[PDB]
Amino acid sequence: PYSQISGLNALQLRLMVPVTVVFTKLPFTVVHEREIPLKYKMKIKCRFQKAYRRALDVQEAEAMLDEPQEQAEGSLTVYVISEHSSLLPQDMMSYIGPKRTAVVRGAFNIIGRRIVQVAQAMSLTEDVLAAALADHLPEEKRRPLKSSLGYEITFSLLNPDP
């Protein structure tokens, strides 16, 4: 398939991260996306799809509210908490827990910027992909191990003087 290969020469990859924001008026479903410049024809564009769902009714909370069945790879789930909810310390405004669950104090642009910052911290920042693709980068960096179908770990104990 020479024609298909030539089409693949310029592949417009876009990456979608399903994030469901839960507030505690209008499901805005705002989408924030950006594209890091690549030196060659192939380009990428990370896309954030925020659901802005209303509530359906800190480590203690996430343990019981998170549904293990509703787990999707590369899908974040943040929870809006009150500006005085005291679930997290008042000096802490964003909480980044494990298992794709976050909490942000607070639709509005000011809070939406916080969700964007938290999502960038937890998924698909420009630096993560810069390591993955470096031949297309316009610039260390290549420290990450390369991709493979398998890896082998060997734990050797050196005993120079038995």
mmCIF file of N, CA and C in Angstrom, residues 28 36 62 76 98 101 131:
data_model
loop_
_atom_site.group_PDB
_atom_site.id
_atom_site.type_symbol
_atom_site.label_atom_id
_atom_site.label_comp_id
_atom_site.label_asym_id
_atom_site.label_seq_id
_atom_site.Cartn_x
_atom_site.Cartn_y
_atom_site.Cartn_z
ATOM 1 N N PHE A 28 -20.830 22.716 30.848
ATOM 2 C CA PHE A 28 -20.167 23.474 29.789
ATOM 3 C C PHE A 28 -19.427 22.562 28.818
ATOM 4 N N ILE A 36 2.290 20.914 20.390
ATOM 5 C CA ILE A 36 3.720 21.239 20.426
ATOM 6 C C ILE A 36 4.294 21.150 19.019
ATOM 7 N N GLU A 62 -11.606 9.294 48.735
ATOM 8 C CA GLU A 62 -11.326 8.709 47.426
ATOM 9 C C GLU A 62 -11.401 7.188 47.464
ATOM 10 N N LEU A 76 -8.757 10.653 33.424
ATOM 11 C CA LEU A 76 -8.732 11.263 34.742
ATOM 12 C C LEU A 76 -10.153 11.504 35.249
ATOM 13 N N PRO A 98 -3.708 9.014 43.922
ATOM 14 C CA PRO A 98 -3.468 7.905 42.997
ATOM 15 C C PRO A 98 -4.758 7.458 42.318
ATOM 16 N N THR A 101 -7.452 10.013 40.190
ATOM 17 C CA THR A 101 -8.445 10.771 40.943
ATOM 18 C C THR A 101 -7.776 11.997 41.543
ATOM 19 N N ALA A 131 10.107 13.314 25.411
ATOM 20 C CA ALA A 131 10.962 12.148 25.590
ATOM 21 C C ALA A 131 10.584 11.031 24.624
#
